[PDB]
Amino acid sequence: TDPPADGALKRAEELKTQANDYFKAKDYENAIKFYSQAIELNPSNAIYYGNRSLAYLRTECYGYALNDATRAIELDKKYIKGYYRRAASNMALGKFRAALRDYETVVKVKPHDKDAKMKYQECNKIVKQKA
């Protein structure tokens, strides 16, 4: 099948928004759920997997987080916030050098963004904490 049609896709877009509304509601698993429902509607959206892993990242489900974050990068090979998700996954897992590599890439794309810098430098300093 081609990309699912409008209503279906826009509803996946909806569940993106609804799950965002659940993240705003501080419920990451419903966010996880609605994002999964969005994966039922469309597939190749790093947005869905990225914030799903981000939700797992909130619920310290880093095993799933690392999977889904990496999965997003497979769906949208260039998604800056997607690398950021995978980076956080590695970072939280204790892979500071691995996370640094991803964070580094993010800060190499937008070094003007302290939102990217922050976690880069945070991982970087922690590498130095390790000597």
């Binding site: 993106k16 965002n20 993240f23 705003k24 947005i47 990225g50 914030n51 981000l54 916030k81």
Partner: peptide, 5 residues
């Protein structure tokens, strides 16, 4: 803000 995605 709201830009989770």
């Amino acid at each position: 803000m709201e830009e989770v995605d």
